[PDB]
Design a protein around this motif. Structure first.
Motif, PDB file in Angstrom:
ATOM      1  N   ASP A   1      56.681  48.569  18.938  1.00  0.00           N
ATOM      2  CA  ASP A   1      56.885  50.349  18.943  1.00  0.00           C
ATOM      3  C   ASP A   1      55.692  50.454  17.864  1.00  0.00           C
ATOM      4  OD1 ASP A   1      58.898  48.690  20.018  1.00  0.00           O
ATOM      5  OD2 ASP A   1      60.341  50.365  18.763  1.00  0.00           O
ATOM      6  N   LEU A   2      54.399  50.210  17.323  1.00  0.00           N
ATOM      7  CA  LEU A   2      53.303  50.581  16.770  1.00  0.00           C
ATOM      8  C   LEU A   2      52.601  50.401  17.591  1.00  0.00           C
ATOM      9  CD1 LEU A   2      52.718  51.183  13.676  1.00  0.00           C
ATOM     10  CD2 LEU A   2      51.606  49.658  13.312  1.00  0.00           C
ATOM     11  N   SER A   3      52.473  49.952  18.476  1.00  0.00           N
ATOM     12  CA  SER A   3      51.138  50.413  19.568  1.00  0.00           C
ATOM     13  C   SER A   3      52.261  51.100  19.987  1.00  0.00           C
ATOM     14  CB  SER A   3      50.700  48.186  20.297  1.00  0.00           C
ATOM     15  OG  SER A   3      50.024  47.977  19.941  1.00  0.00           O
ATOM     16  N   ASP A   4      50.700  52.381  20.794  1.00  0.00           N
ATOM     17  CA  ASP A   4      51.444  53.371  21.089  1.00  0.00           C
ATOM     18  C   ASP A   4      51.031  53.033  22.394  1.00  0.00           C
ATOM     19  OD1 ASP A   4      49.038  52.974  19.780  1.00  0.00           O
ATOM     20  OD2 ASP A   4      48.318  56.043  19.855  1.00  0.00           O
ATOM     21  N   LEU A   5      50.130  52.260  23.488  1.00  0.00           N
ATOM     22  CA  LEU A   5      49.872  51.931  24.000  1.00  0.00           C
ATOM     23  C   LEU A   5      48.949  53.322  25.019  1.00  0.00           C
ATOM     24  CD1 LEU A   5      49.539  50.154  26.421  1.00  0.00           C
ATOM     25  CD2 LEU A   5      51.800  49.432  24.953  1.00  0.00           C
ATOM     26  N   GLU A   6      49.056  54.006  24.700  1.00  0.00           N
ATOM     27  CA  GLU A   6      46.874  55.679  24.430  1.00  0.00           C
ATOM     28  C   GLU A   6      45.541  54.650  23.049  1.00  0.00           C
ATOM     29  OE1 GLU A   6      50.427  57.438  23.992  1.00  0.00           O
ATOM     30  OE2 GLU A   6      49.363  56.758  25.629  1.00  0.00           O
TER      31      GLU A   6
ATOM     32  N   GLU B   1      46.920  46.458  36.921  1.00  0.00           N
ATOM     33  CA  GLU B   1      47.489  47.874  37.846  1.00  0.00           C
ATOM     34  C   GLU B   1      48.803  47.391  37.784  1.00  0.00           C
ATOM     35  OE1 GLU B   1      49.573  46.981  40.555  1.00  0.00           O
ATOM     36  OE2 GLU B   1      48.672  47.085  41.837  1.00  0.00           O
ATOM     37  N   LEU B   2      49.204  45.964  37.502  1.00  0.00           N
ATOM     38  CA  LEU B   2      51.108  46.432  37.690  1.00  0.00           C
ATOM     39  C   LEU B   2      51.673  46.109  35.630  1.00  0.00           C
ATOM     40  CD1 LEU B   2      51.368  43.173  39.748  1.00  0.00           C
ATOM     41  CD2 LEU B   2      53.183  44.518  39.427  1.00  0.00           C
ATOM     42  N   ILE B   3      50.217  45.920  35.106  1.00  0.00           N
ATOM     43  CA  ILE B   3      51.153  46.279  33.438  1.00  0.00           C
ATOM     44  C   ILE B   3      51.035  47.414  33.105  1.00  0.00           C
ATOM     45  CG2 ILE B   3      48.993  46.049  31.914  1.00  0.00           C
ATOM     46  CD1 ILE B   3      49.274  43.272  30.520  1.00  0.00           C
ATOM     47  N   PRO B   4      50.846  48.497  33.647  1.00  0.00           N
ATOM     48  CA  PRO B   4      51.473  50.106  33.180  1.00  0.00           C
ATOM     49  C   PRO B   4      52.442  50.115  34.411  1.00  0.00           C
ATOM     50  CG  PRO B   4      48.996  49.909  33.948  1.00  0.00           C
ATOM     51  CD  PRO B   4      49.677  49.211  34.125  1.00  0.00           C
ATOM     52  N   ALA B   5      52.225  49.146  35.945  1.00  0.00           N
ATOM     53  CA  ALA B   5      53.434  49.955  37.109  1.00  0.00           C
ATOM     54  C   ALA B   5      54.959  49.303  36.283  1.00  0.00           C
ATOM     55  CB  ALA B   5      53.064  49.334  38.331  1.00  0.00           C
ATOM     56  N   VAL B   6      55.156  48.330  36.022  1.00  0.00           N
ATOM     57  CA  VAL B   6      56.308  47.814  35.131  1.00  0.00           C
ATOM     58  C   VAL B   6      56.218  48.302  33.342  1.00  0.00           C
ATOM     59  CG1 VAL B   6      56.655  45.467  37.035  1.00  0.00           C
ATOM     60  CG2 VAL B   6      55.680  45.484  34.604  1.00  0.00           C
ATOM     61  N   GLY B   7      55.483  48.666  33.236  1.00  0.00           N
ATOM     62  CA  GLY B   7      55.642  48.858  31.443  1.00  0.00           C
ATOM     63  C   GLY B   7      55.960  47.956  31.238  1.00  0.00           C
ATOM     64  N   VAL B   8      55.327  47.163  30.670  1.00  0.00           N
ATOM     65  CA  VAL B   8      55.495  45.661  29.757  1.00  0.00           C
ATOM     66  C   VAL B   8      55.134  46.761  28.339  1.00  0.00           C
ATOM     67  CG1 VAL B   8      54.157  44.019  28.806  1.00  0.00           C
ATOM     68  CG2 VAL B   8      54.019  44.179  31.458  1.00  0.00           C
ATOM     69  N   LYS B   9      55.932  46.205  27.646  1.00  0.00           N
ATOM     70  CA  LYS B   9      55.873  46.444  26.053  1.00  0.00           C
ATOM     71  C   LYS B   9      54.374  45.749  25.126  1.00  0.00           C
ATOM     72  CE  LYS B   9      57.538  50.616  25.451  1.00  0.00           C
ATOM     73  NZ  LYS B   9      56.561  51.541  25.336  1.00  0.00           N
ATOM     74  N   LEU B  10      55.154  44.008  25.659  1.00  0.00           N
ATOM     75  CA  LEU B  10      54.504  42.951  24.776  1.00  0.00           C
ATOM     76  C   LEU B  10      54.336  41.851  25.705  1.00  0.00           C
ATOM     77  CD1 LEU B  10      53.478  42.379  22.241  1.00  0.00           C
ATOM     78  CD2 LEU B  10      56.088  41.847  21.330  1.00  0.00           C
ATOM     79  N   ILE B  11      52.900  41.548  25.672  1.00  0.00           N
ATOM     80  CA  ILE B  11      52.388  39.962  25.824  1.00  0.00           C
ATOM     81  C   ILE B  11      52.563  38.940  25.134  1.00  0.00           C
ATOM     82  CG2 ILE B  11      50.993  40.048  26.048  1.00  0.00           C
ATOM     83  CD1 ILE B  11      51.909  38.519  28.521  1.00  0.00           C
ATOM     84  N   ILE B  12      53.097  37.414  25.113  1.00  0.00           N
ATOM     85  CA  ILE B  12      53.636  37.063  24.371  1.00  0.00           C
ATOM     86  C   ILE B  12      53.180  35.933  24.746  1.00  0.00           C
ATOM     87  CG2 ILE B  12      55.074  35.109  22.389  1.00  0.00           C
ATOM     88  CD1 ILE B  12      57.046  38.391  22.548  1.00  0.00           C
TER      89      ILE B  12
ATOM     90  N   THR C   1      43.227  47.167  29.395  1.00  0.00           N
ATOM     91  CA  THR C   1      44.975  48.216  28.581  1.00  0.00           C
ATOM     92  C   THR C   1      45.299  47.885  27.580  1.00  0.00           C
ATOM     93  OG1 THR C   1      45.867  46.132  29.932  1.00  0.00           O
ATOM     94  CG2 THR C   1      45.780  48.080  31.192  1.00  0.00           C
ATOM     95  N   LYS C   2      46.006  48.622  26.624  1.00  0.00           N
ATOM     96  CA  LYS C   2      45.952  48.215  25.106  1.00  0.00           C
ATOM     97  C   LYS C   2      47.070  47.929  25.343  1.00  0.00           C
ATOM     98  CE  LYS C   2      41.777  50.876  25.837  1.00  0.00           C
ATOM     99  NZ  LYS C   2      41.200  51.549  26.929  1.00  0.00           N
ATOM    100  N   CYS C   3      47.766  46.806  25.324  1.00  0.00           N
ATOM    101  CA  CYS C   3      48.850  45.787  25.787  1.00  0.00           C
ATOM    102  C   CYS C   3      49.260  44.921  24.647  1.00  0.00           C
ATOM    103  CB  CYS C   3      49.165  45.400  26.958  1.00  0.00           C
ATOM    104  SG  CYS C   3      50.949  44.347  26.552  1.00  0.00           S
TER     105      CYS C   3
END
Ligand SMILES: Nc1ncnc2c1ncn2[C@@H]1O[C@H](COP(=O)(O)OP(=O)(O)OP(=O)(O)O)[C@@H](O)[C@H]1O
Length: 311
Positions: free
Chosen positions: A31-36, A118-129, A159-161
């Motif tokens: 929750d510093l990356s704002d996804l904007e 299209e799926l990385i905003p569809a399920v709402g990914v907060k972080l990829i590791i 996408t800004k993940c």
DNA sequence: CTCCAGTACAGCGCGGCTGAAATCATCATTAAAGCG
């Protein structure tokens, strides 16, 4: 046997301050990356057996237990790169991991990027590791392939993940290949092993937190004046081998009548797990091996780099 | 779209050739000792 005590002796976790420093930084990244706008893109290092996978499993516990029990959201993701990863190869496994897709009978690397973006905003990914970054260097030569690196920059800028890469300490020259990858990954850290045995270390508190974490209900007898001497004589700073030998002693004590880990069964644990050690490493437990001061010497800087000298 | 085959391009290893360095020959020159 009472297998609850065995699994409860194996699954034990001690939070050294470097680990909580890491997990604080990944919540900071989440929750510093704002996804904007542009993300932060941390990088984590560490040698073999320094507790990396345990750290991320701690993280997906404390970050995704309730949200995975609630529904199909999957906010945080966990990926290992397979060896000599083609960009379509890493992309398709990262795709079949998240969601519930079919996802890999086509290998076209443009349309599966379409489906993944299209799926990385569809399920709402907060972080990829990503766990294993050292798989992008060649075996016999030190050419590094950065098809996957430029592809990861592409999915980063698409996408800004936020992305958190783990990996070996020799795997950073891969990040030295692409300078835009080098600049996009700002926070690199150092998860090095335990430093010294001389006294008043973090090693002390780790050791006695492990001692109260052990299944024996009075005292484990460890973290004493002479026991950490032979412990640091056995494992260099090496978390995996130290914990492995400790577990192999704890099972031997609970196999028969024993009240604590003691000086008859800890030896047989040194007998078993002495295989991975080098030839010049000294075997200190059986009959008369007193340990010199030079053998508790701190680990060097190229401690996660001995996969790299020969070529 | 995927696998197999052909064919090009690139790379590493081995062999042969060339060059340089080391060693041995070979004698040549210089100096000292012995003989005339
Ligand atoms: N904080 C900790 N407290 C107790 N035990 C730990 C801790 N961290 C790691 N271990 C032990 O060390 C072992 C190795 O863990 P882990 O595989 O995460 O290390 P690693 O560096 O990821 O190794 P690899 O990179 O090869 O997977 C685990 O079995 C675990 O029991």
């Amino acid at each position: 046997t009472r297998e609850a005590r065995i699994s409860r002796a194996k699954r034990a976790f001690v939070s050294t301050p470097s680990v909580r420093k890491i997990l604080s930084y990944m919540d900071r990244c989440r929750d510093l990356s704002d996804l904007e706008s542009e993300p932060t893109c941390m990088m984590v290092y560490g040698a073999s057996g320094v507790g990396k996978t345990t750290v991320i499993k701690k993280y997906l516990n404390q970050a995704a237990a309730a949200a995975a029990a609630g529904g199909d959201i999957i906010p945080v993701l966990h990926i290992e790169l397979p060896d000599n990863a083609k960009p379509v190869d890493a992309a398709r496994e990262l795709l079949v991991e998240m969601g519930d897709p079919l996802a890999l009978y086509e290998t076209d690397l443009a349309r599966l990027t379409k489906r993944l973006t299209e799926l990385i905003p569809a399920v709402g990914v907060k972080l990829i590791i990503i766990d294993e970054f050292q798989h992008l260097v060649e075996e016999r030569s030190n050419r590094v392939l950065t098809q996957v690196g430029n592809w990861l920059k592409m999915i980063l800028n698409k996408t800004k993940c936020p992305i958190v890469i783990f990996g070996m300490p020799y795997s950073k020259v891969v990040l030295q290949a692409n300078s835009q990858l080098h600049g996009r990954f700002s926070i690199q850290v150092e998860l090095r092993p335990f430093s010294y045995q001389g006294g008043r270390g973090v090693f002390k508190t780790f050791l006695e937190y492990l001692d109260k974490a052990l299944p024996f209900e009075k005292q484990a007898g460890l973290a004493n004046e002479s026991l950490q001497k032979k412990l640091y004589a056995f494992s260099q700073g090496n978390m995996r081998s130290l914990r492995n030998l400790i577990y192999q002693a704890s099972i031997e004590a609970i196999d028969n009548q024993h009240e604590t880990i003691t000086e008859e069964d800890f030896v047989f644990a040194s007998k078993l797990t002495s295989g991975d050690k080098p030839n010049s490493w000294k075997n200190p437990f059986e009959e008369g091996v007193e340990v010199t001061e030079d053998m508790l010497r701190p680990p060097p800087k190229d401690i996660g780099w001995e996969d790299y000298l020969r070529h």
